[PDB]
Symmetry: T
Subunit: 151 residues, 12 copies
């Protein structure tokens, strides 16, 4: 079995691009996923994506990732970062390294958003850089997996 | 189908009237819905109702509400009020105004029940008035949506 | 005078509808009292109202209520809700059940407004529903003050 | 008017005399005052008593005490003990030593009752001994003002 | 005629023994369930088991337990112990007494693990004794439910 | 010439200057008011003053200020600054800008004196500068009310 | 002995009157004990006394009190008041009502001295009244057992 | 052969099965000890027992256990659980593995009972299962000392 | 420089009026200094000013002030108010009395701004009155150094 | 289409690679700067770098950035992130948008490291991805300044 | 009985060098005492030493010290440092100046070890320097008690 | 050339002996350094000393110390101990073992002084022993660097 990256999107992320005409639209979750997939293909890495509003579905997906041989996870937990011990335990239980990504700056909002049950065990965290944040996580992930020289 | 007002009941609310009715009352969640649907009919307002023990299902329902053009949500999040950021983010993400309702007086109970992830963003909150709390919320909602005669 | 229901308004409620709206509505404390009195009259319920900026005067009114045979109090303590143990102790002392009402949503403002010396002992709490909150409390109260087949 | 000893009863204490807030056990405020006055007369010591539900009235009384040359105050602040820095400041401002008395045991009830704005500045505190707590305070005060042989 | 005792395992428990058996356990969740079932039979007690990564599924199972007349629940809530009031509310709502079990010593890991939404309402708690903890809980339940010995 | 400034003195401020040679000297509250009145006179500004030990009296006075056209309030809340939300709400309610003054340095005393319900809504705060603090507030007020250029 | 009333002195109380009899003057623990024994003898009530610096010795004495049929304990736990749950459990375990006494005013000293493991369970508390606090406690106890009354 | 397990009962446990300790359970401490001894004897393990109300005696006993080569300790610290660092340091100092046991459910009682100075260092913890908790701890301990296979 | 006064401005104060002078105002730090120097000239008092972004420079300047015979310091520590113990220690070390000034109202901004390492040791604090704050501080200082309140 | 990006490195960053590679040795501060400078050159964007151990030097540099017309700051504050209000105020004062970068994962180390005086005002935050974090920040920054490209 | 300097060792210190000496070090408590006695003899000061696992025994020893004429106490309270108010009160009660010593660095260990009931009242504290810490304390004590000048 | 042991004095330490010679003490920073340098020469160890009021200068000096080959640092950070993470990171960055010294007892002064950013990483801490504390730290260092048991 080989090296795959898995991108996990948490609850409410499916909403992206419904705001549309000005404040945040028109960009969508599928648009993000499509860019990442292209980015991965360009490096000859198999990338899969998942989104759910259900915490249990996310946990199940992480469990499947281990059996599937996934090497690294890029996860935007969204609201679940502040609340889900089960998510943290699933990631730890499978021992697949992960990078935490947030489109918005979690630190610029309510104080409860400062707390995370994931960040302390993540390799790294990116927030506030929008969709580029996932790309950055992917770029890092590729180097870690297929290190240094490609030529 | 399509709807103007949506009533959402959180986990365990389905238990109402189901254990020791002589002690705890015969009123069921179904009775509450029946009462509200009739109250809604009196105003020619289309009312939908939803209950689940699963957070993800509630979130999905809320997303569905945006597509349906629901104008207001009446929600009793039950236990989820103190724990679910995901729920708060769904409501905020679809930008549908809501009224928070609890059968019991949350303040009269454990300290952890004092905190809500919804209350600060609600139009208003009602607790401790039992089933009538939902009716009052419905009365307020109808007036806001189709203003008529003030009292 | 003897009354079955007493409505108490706390400090600064006299200002309502005074600095014109904008800043809020034309609704006045008098409009609310008028609306409540009519609602009680329609139910053949005798209702009295009271407002003051003086805490001791409020405590005295509650003491008076006990002698007047008042069965339930609907109180908007306003600012006193966060500060007055004397108010809580008066209500407990006369042992008259009460409903707490706020026009605005107490939870949507400063952190200090989250806390109350009354809420845990109230039958129930209504906030953020404007004037209608008082009407809802009155509606509940009339229903409670009815059967007496209880003991 | 120029008493040696002043006994101040705080808010809601009048309810002992008007018919018990809880309570134990139809001992009235007037009964307490009579006992203290007799105890004071027996020692040839002049004593006055005061009760109010109003913070300002209490503050004014304390100021009046200064002009009257009161040497010690026995005060049962009741609910005010937990809230009134204005009371603390009146007492410190006039520099009259005081003993704090509570009929009930303030530590045996809600956590908020554990805190006082007075107790740190009192000579001493008595709580939970009922009416007898005032008598003890008076006995201590008499010995302090009019020392005699061991008591 | 379904079961007398129900054992619930929380999220991530399905992973037990999954990777990599040489470091840490060989033992699996099915191994645990088989031992408990054997232990139950030996006592002529009907025992059922359930595991899920979804909170709602567990809540549904608990509600189902009431309908089946389950006398006692042995639950390892895992991560959910620190986060789910919904779980707490389900167990209370059905009013089925429970014993809380953890394989590992919850107190020996991060501070957040110290807090439980279940422990205070449990009959008892066992942590850190591994698989034997479930057996111990069963022993206790059997004696409670069918206290074989007259005494 | 319409512009009017109102100075409010809170509880216990009436005591200023009683123990005269040592305790806090000879300056009285009346002395302070005379100086302020004269300072106002020089600037062609109308100024009124008020003191009370009763919170309700102060709140009423503020409400009266709105109707009297008062432009700005200089308030020394004294002990009320730490306790009275009602006071905050009256000032906010009439929307009259205010400056908060204390003779003593609040920060230099008990930790509870560090907190205020007024300071965050004041234009500014002055403490620990004695009676001059009021003059400074007046100087600022006069300039804000009738701004001056080079001359 | 057996006795009806037991007075317990906690650690360091043996020091009273030892150092700089111009520090706290000349009163000793024995002086206090003699005064109490005499006060008890007037009532024909048998009183025992005990002091120790060892927590276990105090717990053992309390247990002994139960067998001896002591009806009330007057206890000055001294330092143990802030630290010993074992003391709290002994008193509750034997179910002998108690009054807590401190010579000094506990609230006037370090913050850590503000918390007691006994006060919430005591009948009453007296502090800051010196040696007289023990006499007051004894007078209350005697009256509880063998009441006399003017009123 | 040849193995000793030591059971330590902390302060106030001597009261068990008497009259009115807080929770009257029928079983005495001796009854508990006799059951444990029999259980150990079945495994050809020696079971030492110790109870004291004195912390120092317990600390000395632990030191003694090290000199005597005790394999494991089962300890119910009772009230000392929440207060004694010295106990934790004794167990750590001798490095004898231990299991912490409580008859009652520590989590169900005052918040101060929630904290243990031993739990984080224990192999495991059992609480609220009454006398059976000690037996369970012993069963685990024997298996740890004497793994079944091969004798 | 006799009866010298020293004015110290902390980090970032150099920016005053630099950016968006419309919108934010055009008063500059130099303008403030020139005003203070002139105000000082009028009273025949020597005054110096200092600003730095460097804590060490400020500490050195304070040390220098003692040797220079500076009699009072007027300081706006800016950001350093909430972070520098070193500043507090420098001012305390030289024993030069000081007044703390801020242009803006520190209490109306983030919670972290509510704490000062200076305020408890200043004679007084002025905040939120802008440039005039420095002038008021100077006005007080002159009276204190060279009192001419009386002609 | 050329602009100015400024990279700021905080205290102790100058140590990178200077001891015991591999601890995580080898990579130096200059190596990071060369990579960034090269990365900027490829975009035809002008980039400057600064490192210092002195907070004042950093504050000065940031002020200079304003005069220089710097568009965006990429800053690794290092230790200053948890301590420097002066730094926060400098960036806000000049109003230059910034991205916060940390080589290591701040969330994975002592609790004090979890708090930043910058993060809430940052566009975004990157931590734990090492040197790459700076490049990602630069990539985002380039797109921000010069959006229109072959992309 | 009779010594100028008294060294007190708290609970568990008797274990030093007891187990795994090769692992943990061979130094024993007697070795430490022997060094100190020798250092004392060199300076012609009498020194006594004491160790116990019982708090009461330590308190009694301190009391004895007053009568003995001890001038200074060097105490390593060990675990009792974090828990014993009684110890603090004993030292204060006899008013013997003391120095607090710990072999290990308390600040490097769990958070609860960061608080001492003695540190605030000690002349000084030494921790983490092992046995030498006692010697340093002794060196300071000698210089304090006896004039530096030999002969 | 270069030192083996380096002594660092923090901000304000330069003031020692400057003011209040009779009240303060007339020992200066130079006296301490000369004593240390002599103590060092006496063991044939080179010792360098440094003081600054500038955190950056201190950090730079520590960096220099690594390249110099300094074996150990004795540091009195003074006020910086409570605020300077940069200082902690410098000492850790160079990996030079350090002992933390304070002339005064930090524990006896404000609560904020109780926390240190160095203490947990120091070998040891000495405070409150005046100048001797530095000498004691040196004595430990010399023994650590050149032990005399090998000899």
């Amino acid at each position: 079995m080989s090296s795959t990256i898995l991108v996990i999107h948490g609850p409410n992320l499916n909403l992206l691009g419904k705001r549309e005409p000005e404040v945040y639209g028109h960009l969508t979750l599928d648009n993000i996923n499509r860019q990442l997939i292209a980015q991965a293909e360009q490096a000859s890495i198999t990338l899969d994506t998942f989104q759910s509003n259900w915490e249990g579905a996310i946990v199940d997906r992480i469990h499947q990732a281990q059996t599937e041989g996934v090497k690294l996870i890029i996860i935007n937990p969204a609201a679940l970062t502040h609340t889900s011990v089960a998510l943290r335990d699933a990631l730890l239980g499978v021992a697949i390294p992960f990078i935490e990504v947030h489109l918005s700056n979690v630190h610029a909002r309510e104080a409860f958003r400062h707390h995370s049950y994931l960040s302390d065990k993540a390799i790294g965290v990116i927030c506030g850089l929008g969709a580029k944040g996932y790309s950055f996580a992917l770029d890092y992930a590729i180097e870690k997996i297929q290190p240094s020289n490609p030529n």
